[PDB]
Design an enzyme around this catalytic site. Structure first.
Site, PDB file in Angstrom:
ATOM      1  N   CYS A  32       4.223   0.845   9.381  1.00  0.00           N
ATOM      2  CA  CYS A  32       4.024  -0.262   8.466  1.00  0.00           C
ATOM      3  C   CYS A  32       5.350  -0.764   7.909  1.00  0.00           C
ATOM      4  O   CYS A  32       6.309  -0.009   7.683  1.00  0.00           O
ATOM      5  CB  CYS A  32       3.087   0.157   7.331  1.00  0.00           C
ATOM      6  SG  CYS A  32       1.382   0.264   7.932  1.00  0.00           S
ATOM      7  N   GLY A  64       3.333   5.452  10.353  1.00  0.00           N
ATOM      8  CA  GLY A  64       4.654   5.197   9.811  1.00  0.00           C
ATOM      9  C   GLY A  64       5.269   3.874  10.226  1.00  0.00           C
ATOM     10  O   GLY A  64       6.404   3.573   9.816  1.00  0.00           O
ATOM     11  N   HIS A  70       0.807  -1.216   0.000  1.00  0.00           N
ATOM     12  CA  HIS A  70       0.000   0.000   0.000  1.00  0.00           C
ATOM     13  C   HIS A  70       0.837   1.262   0.000  1.00  0.00           C
ATOM     14  O   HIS A  70       0.271   2.356  -0.066  1.00  0.00           O
ATOM     15  CB  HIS A  70      -0.994   0.019   1.161  1.00  0.00           C
ATOM     16  CG  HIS A  70      -0.388   0.236   2.515  1.00  0.00           C
ATOM     17  ND1 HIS A  70      -0.335  -0.760   3.466  1.00  0.00           N
ATOM     18  CD2 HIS A  70       0.108   1.348   3.105  1.00  0.00           C
ATOM     19  CE1 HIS A  70       0.185  -0.271   4.582  1.00  0.00           C
ATOM     20  NE2 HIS A  70       0.491   0.997   4.377  1.00  0.00           N
TER      21      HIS A  70
END
EC number: 3.4.19.12
Lengths: 297, 302
Positions: free
Chosen positions: A142, A140, A38
């Site tokens: 991920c 942040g 993503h």
């Protein structure tokens, strides 16, 4: 004590990945960087992202990968389920011996939480029966990963993708398949009803005994099936015979038969702790496995 | 719920761990630049641990009596000295993995990460809080001595604890990296008593600020107090008195929420005097005292 694996072998693998105005973390192993796909989305793509379509429209130079001060040049890119695989012109010299595993619900792992490619904290999580994890992850985070270490080998089992409205977390294995029924689209998603990891609660009771705490024990016993009837009533997972076998070492070590400890837990579930606490907790703890307990007692 | 004990990443410290052996006694040491730091009781025979004369035992030792190993690789010892309860072994190789570091002596209530080690090899990492009685609740087995506690600020590792012993109640005691014990303990194989422990007030206050940050603020009352009036009451509930430094380290959370420190102190005093009344804070009827103001900001604001 909830204890994480030493994180140094994983720290040497974390990098920063940027695409457009999106930045998250990547895992750099050999000459491939793994990260959540993503990162290629936009605000106007988040609700129903056609990832194959979005990805074909990207070039290698659209991906900025930084390891420390150094930029790593992306030479190819592909997608495996929900994970992007960025081939880079440089093999990571600190790559550990490693494997990718898919963990079972009830199993534990260490999380290395990272921001902007920089490691920030390490802590132990369990894969919940409903396939969420009760993590500590902020904007942040991920691409942070979860892992276990056996000998020299790092077994990566989790990569972070999302936070559910309830504050629990969801992610994939390193093949990019989600744990649970979740989807990497920007929607409010509910999980199935969670349940308590019974075999782990029992391991933790044994630990409380091994550290000289016995106030919850009792003179009684139960059959496996009658215990499981009560367990299911309280949204505890069924205890299998394998679980009973797995708990043997702790049973021998204390000379408390597994089904005796089941009778204690049954008592705790029906009565309550009535003010008391166990190993410091007002609640029954279910994120220690029997192995976690034995490796430390 | 929402908060958990989080350790610092341990890699910078893993790169400094070695083992140190004298005879058959092996523990861990910390290799920084060309010095290895470790507990002085490595020079004791298990029969000498009862009532050791450390200065006497050290005069008998030479550099060639110390086996220092990084993994299986021997590090040659070229000097030795004792500083309080730690041994400093000068070695002939500067550790190429030496981080930026400092040696700090922490206050009760402060938290730190422990890298538990055996035979120079790291086993696990976890957060500890220094109790007001100068003990920690570690998970330490035989061979763990010389494991260290630390915090990491930017690039810099602040080493604050080195492990030496277990007390009869099961808790743990040790020194800073200059060899000075935290609390009234001595590195002798005797039975030693920890002072009765108390609750870490500044960390409970941090917890209440964390609750407020997350919208859970039923316990905020209309009152304020003086620091002295609070301290006198708190001590009747086995809470630690606050210091000026405690007031100061709550500054950032006070500014974030707009709730003056002494106003929050008044809220806590009412909780102590009147109890929770079946209500919860952050999902619990128990007040948590092992998250510092720094820990709270990290997990709330990142």
């Amino acid at each position: 004590r909830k204890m994480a694996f030493p994180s140094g072998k994983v720290e040497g693998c974390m990098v920063q990945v940027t695409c457009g105005t999106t930045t998250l973390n990547g895992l750099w192993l050999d000459d491939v960087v793994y990260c959540p796909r993503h990162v290629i989305c936009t605000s106007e793509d988040m609700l129903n992202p056609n990832y194959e379509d979005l990805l074909i429209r990207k070039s290698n130079h659209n991906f900025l990968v930084q390891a420390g001060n150094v930029q790593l040049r992306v030479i190819g890119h592909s997608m495996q389920n929900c994970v992007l695989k960025l081939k880079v012109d440089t093999a990571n010299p600190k790559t550990p011996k490693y494997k990718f595993v898919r963990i079972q619900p009830g199993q534990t792992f260490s999380v290395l939480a990272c921001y902007n490619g920089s490691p920030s904290g390490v802590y132990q999580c369990a894969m919940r029966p409903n396939f969420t994890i009760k993590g500590s992850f902020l904007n942040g985070s991920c691409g942070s990963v979860g892992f276990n270490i056996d000998y020299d080998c790092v077994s990566f089992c989790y990569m972070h993708h999302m936070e559910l409205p309830t504050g629990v977390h969801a992610g994939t294995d390193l093949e990019g398949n989600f744990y649970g029924p979740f989807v990497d689209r920007q929607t409010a998603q509910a999980a199935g009803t969670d349940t308590t990891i019974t075999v782990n609660v029992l391991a933790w009771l044994y630990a409380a005994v091994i550290n000289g705490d016995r106030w919850f024990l009792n003179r009684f016993t139960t059959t496996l099936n009658d215990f499981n009837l009560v367990a299911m009533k309280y949204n505890y997972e069924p205890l299998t015979q394998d679980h009973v076998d797995i708990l043997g070492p702790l049973s021998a070590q204390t000379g408390i038969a597994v089904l005796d400890m089941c009778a204690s837990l049954k008592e705790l579930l029906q009565n309550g702790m009535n003010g008391r606490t166990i190993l410091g907790s007002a609640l029954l703890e279910d994120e220690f496995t029997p192995f976690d307990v034995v490796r430390q007692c």
